[PDB]
Each structure stands twice: as structure tokens, then as C-alpha cells.
Design a binder for this molecule. Sequence first.
Ligand code: LP5
Ligand code: STE
Lengths: 171, 171, 171, 171
Amino acid sequence: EDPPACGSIVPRREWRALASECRERLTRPVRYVVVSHTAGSHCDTPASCAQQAQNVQSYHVRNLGWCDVGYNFLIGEDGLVYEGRGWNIKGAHAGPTWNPISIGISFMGNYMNRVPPPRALRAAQNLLACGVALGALRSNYEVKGHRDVQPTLSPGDRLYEIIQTWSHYRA
Amino acid sequence: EDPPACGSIVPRREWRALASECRERLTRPVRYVVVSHTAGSHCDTPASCAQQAQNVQSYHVRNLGWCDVGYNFLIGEDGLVYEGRGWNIKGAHAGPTWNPISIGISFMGNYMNRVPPPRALRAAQNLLACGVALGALRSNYEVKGHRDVQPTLSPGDRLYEIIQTWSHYRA
Amino acid sequence: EDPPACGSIVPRREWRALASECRERLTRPVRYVVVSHTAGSHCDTPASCAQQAQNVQSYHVRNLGWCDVGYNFLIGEDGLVYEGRGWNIKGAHAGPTWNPISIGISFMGNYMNRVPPPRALRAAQNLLACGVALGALRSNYEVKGHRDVQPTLSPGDRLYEIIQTWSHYRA
Amino acid sequence: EDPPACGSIVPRREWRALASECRERLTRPVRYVVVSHTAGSHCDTPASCAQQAQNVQSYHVRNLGWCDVGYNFLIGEDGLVYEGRGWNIKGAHAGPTWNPISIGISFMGNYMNRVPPPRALRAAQNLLACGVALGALRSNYEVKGHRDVQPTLSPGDRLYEIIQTWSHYRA
Ligand SMILES: CCCCCCCCCCC[C@@H](O)CC(=O)N[C@H]1[C@@H](OP(=O)(O)O)O[C@H](CO)[C@@H](O)[C@@H]1OC(=O)C[C@H](O)CCCCCCCCCCC
Ligand SMILES: CCCCCCCCCCCCCCCCCC(=O)O
């Protein structure tokens, strides 16, 4: 017994998460969400999306020396939310101006020339309220595309377009 | 001016469903939630879970003459909640004493010999979070096993064995 | 058992109860009878007692969100009995240990410093005979005060006192 | 280690409690607190209140076969808090729906006509604050009175009135 919710977020264990070593808390109620893409391989079943999830925490951790997988949360084309660092700690996903005062969610794959399936987007907007319900995120929050806060092609052109049409999106 | 949610549900159009013809509604808010299985094939891709969702609906409609898939909400082994008749329409899931006063949710496949995947209980349990949040269910909704209200083994031995734990189970 | 029997209860429809939404059944014959009080106002007329019956249900179903008023029967001081959940359905009046195995009759008044009138008693003793006559209660049924199975002053010092003299009373 | 944090509760041994036999746990952090009153005599000295604590346990354990005194904590009008089942152990003060998910504090007395003193009221707040600094209560915990969740006059008009003015109060 540790989680009885929330937007049916996969807890660290089901995807084989090596224990975070991160120790900088984020300051709930955060004001920003940054959307990004892993520019990684994509996955469409919960068995490709767990393996691919534990693939990026390991690059971040085996190779980059990081305390934990960079993104606050992760999202696959299979269509569920993967717990990363969470609401509480600070992520490493948008450089030093934003990392502290935002939450980062990353879609799992490259989105320059493909978009993700609706469930993927549905899984995200959900984490959204179930995270405002928690008070991690302000009622009135601003959403930003990775490339809006850092010079990168993240989250891909096709995934970018979509998030521009989100009500909480704000350049 | 207070509620804003709730859930990640594969909508009818998304599983390529046939249109309902059903017109009887339930008085909101519903107090019971009866659980069940399909005793059909199971699926672990979203892809073949939109298929099973469909076959289940097909049987129910084309063979039993029904006005829809009989269940308010279904569940796939891809760890997703599949919409059927939804929160407002009456189901054909548990006979004429219980159908009019409850919401019936049914897992897909046959569950005498497989306890179902863990995400699923999260997905389903989270779906009940919605009903409440929407005022589809009573905050104090009561969860019944199918076997509790019909003379049945269903939702499957393994699985039943599970639901007895929930925080809202009276029998 | 061919020609019976009893009948002194005022039916729901007659005191204009709201629809009971309960579905949990007692196994009959029922061994134990639990005597409680409403801890509110007494009534002395069918009219008053029809309302008083009304309020209690309102408190149980309106406020507390229940399926029906708790008791199986309520005794008014106007000398008549009020069909609560009756003989075949689980009361909610003495906790999960006793509700499956008892009917709960509860006097509608406050009996800490008042004796309920002889008619109310007559009514109550008379109601039990009825239950026996029907196989609703075991012929050797055990009566118990509310305070005896639960922490409360129900059914009152002056009343508790009386039912401790009842032929069917048990420590 | 070394931060604070909480106490000023009279422990079990001190008020000479019978050794508890209760197995069943609670899951922290608990969200709900239900305010009850013992509906008995009040005590205003460490001497008598320790007396009370025991009478009440006796009632529940020697007279009802309960594994432990029903409450998690009691408050005396001596201004002290009496350790009951505590933060970690499911108590028996409000039915099988509130018991597993809440914390039942009982004021030792009867506040239908009487009001509690300042130091009783302060002890209780302090005790909830305590619960929070320890992660036994949820920082945004809800307080409910005993007549909000079960049919009863507990915890006394004048005191019900007061707890409704509490910041954590929720009808
Ligand atoms: C450990 C014993 C406590 C001792 C206290 C003494 C006071 C007793 C007064 C009358 C007794 C009555 O409470 C006993 C009872 O029958 N309780 C619950 C239950 O018994 P079952 O035998 O298991 O069917 O049957 C009911 C099911 O029909 C069940 O629900 C009842 O009590 C509950 O705990 C349920 C809650 O009270 C339901 C209301 C809360 C749900 C949310 C709405 C409230 C508003 C708050 C916002 C969320
Ligand atoms: C209101 C019912 C109480 C818990 C049932 C909610 C079902 C799980 C869905 C979670 C979304 C809303 C948050 C619920 C709180 C439980 C989880 C938590 O607080 O960490």
C-alpha cells in the first residue's frame, strides 16, 4: 500500500524503476507544464512501453549520471501514464530556468512526422486534472511546448501543433 | 461551479462500436456497481482489445437481440476502460431486479484460471472514481460481485476473489 | 402452518415512506431482536407518528445517504407499528456483527426519563408474536438492548430497564 | 532525526488500559476524523479522567467482547488527550464504512447541554495538528461529527455546534 490512484498512473515498480536518488522537492502548487518527446523509440503495447520506459531512465541514469529518469511523468502510444519523478521532486527535463517551476511530461517516441493516438493525448490531459486535484498544479496553469522554453525540436512538429490547441496551452 | 473531471475511457467510436438503440435511463445517482467477466477471448494490445470490445458487443446485439453491448463499461488487458452503454443508460448485465438500479462493469476474457492484470483493477477502480466525481454514482456506492446478485460463478473465480477487498464492497 | 396470523403493522405506503433502495436479506427465522430508540420526539397519533416515521427516514436516507431507514420496525406511542425494512431485509441499526442476524425494532421517542406508554409496549410485544407466528423469528428469540451490543444509551434508562424484564431478554 | 514534533498524550500504560487485542490496521495518511462523545459523565482531573478512560474501555471490552476501546483517542475536560487505539489501528466508533478510513476521537462527557472547556477543545486541535505533523492524518483531512455519519445525537448539540466552526470541518 502506497498509491490507491490517481489517473491510473503506473507506479515505479510495474515498469521496473530503479530507485530515484533525487532530493530536490518541487514547490507544489506548480504553475507550468512542459510537454516534450523522448525522441526515443516508440511503443504500442504495455510490454513495449515498460521496456522502453525503463530504457530511458537507464540512459539518464547509467550514462548521464542523473539521480533519476529526467521527466516528471512519461506517456506511451500504448496509452497509459508512466510515473517518473512525480509531482513532488524537481525533474531534469527543461534546463535550469524551468525544471524547478514546471512539471514535465514526455510522450514516448519521435513526433516530427507522426502524431500519437487519442488515448495518449487523453491520458495526458487527465494527468492534468488529477494533479490539479492533488494541488501539484494550479487550477489555472499554463502549458508550454518544450521548444518554447528551450531550443530544441522537442516535442516534434506534429505533437506541437496539437498541444497548441489545448485550452491550458500558452506560448 | 465546482467539479472538473474525470476519466481515460476508449469511447464508442474509438473501438469502432455499433450505435446503441437503447433508450431506458438510470436515475442518477446509482448506488450499486456489479462486477463481471465476458467469458470470452482476452486481449493485451489496445488493438485487440478494441476487437474484443467489439465481439462482445456483436454477440450481445446480433445474437441476443440486445440494443447494445450489455455492460455500462468494459475493461481490456491493455489496462484501459472501454465505454459501452455508459453512465446514463440501463445495462443488460445482471437481470431485471439489478439492471435498473446499478452500473455493471465487466472484465474481458474468462477468469476462472487467470487473476486479471494489476493495471486493470486500477483502471476499473479509477473508473468508479469518475462516477462519483461526475455524480453518476453515490459517493457511497456499493460494489457487488455478479455472483452476489445472480446465481453465477461470474466474474470468474480468480477475479471475484479479488474484489472482496475494496473499500466499498457490501454483500 | 396453514391458517395465519398477525398483522398490526402500519405499512410503508400508509405512512408514505420513500422507496426503499435496499437489497440485503436476512436469513429467516431470525434469532435475535435488538431494541433501540430514535432519541427524538415521541408521538401520540397516527398522523404525528406518520411524520415522525417520515423524519427518521429522511435523516437516514437524505442526510446519511442510506438505502432506507435503519430499523425493521419502528414503534410509535400512538400504539401502532411502522413497517421499516420489515422482516426480510437487513436493518442498519447495530453494526455488521448483528445486523445480519437480528431485526431491529426501535421506539420513536426519547426514553431516558420517560416510560413509553403501555400501548407502545403492547404494540411491541404484539409485533414479536406476529414475527414468530410467521417464522420470521425463532420461537425462542433473544431480545437485546441497543447498549448491550453497541456503545450508546439507546434505548434509554427507563426503557432499557423494562426490556430487561422481558421473557425473551438475554444478558 | 531530531525534529519536534507532536505529543502531549497520556499513554495506555499510564491510564492503566487493559492490553489491546486488536489486529486490524489503518492506512496512513488517514483523511477523516469523526467527533464523538462518550455521552457519559465528564472528568476534569488527570486522576478521574484516567478513571473514565478505563470505565469506557471496560464497557467496550468486558461488556462487548471488543478487542480494544472503541476510540482512537479520548479527550477529558482535564485538558489532556488519552491514547486509545491510536493512529495506526482501525477503531470502532463509526460503522464499517467510516471505521477503516477514519480517526474517531471521543470527548469524555455528554455535550447535549454542556459545552466542553477551552482546554478540552485545545487539546483536540493540538491532537489533530499532531496527527498531521506525523503523517497519520492528511494535511487536508476532513473532520465530520458522529451525527454526520451515523444515526445518533452524538456528539452533543452544543459541541456539534462548535466543531462545525472548525476549519477542517466538512458536512
Ligand atoms: C463499530 C460500531 C460503531 C458504534 C457506534 C454506535 C452508533 C450506532 C447507531 C446505529 C447503528 C448503525 O450505525 C449500525 C450499522 O448498521 N452500520 C453500518 C452497516 O451495518 P451492516 O450490518 O454491515 O449492513 O450498514 C450500512 C450499509 O447499509 C453501513 O453503511 C452502516 O454505517 C456506515 O459506516 C456507512 C456510512 O455511514 C454511510 C454514509 C457515508 C458515505 C458518504 C456520505 C456522508 C457525507 C460525507 C461526504 C463523503
Ligand atoms: C473520493 C474517493 C476516495 C478515494 C477514491 C478515488 C479513486 C482513485 C482516483 C484518484 C483521483 C482522485 C484522488 C483520490 C485520492 C486517492 C489517492 C491519493 O489521495 O493519493
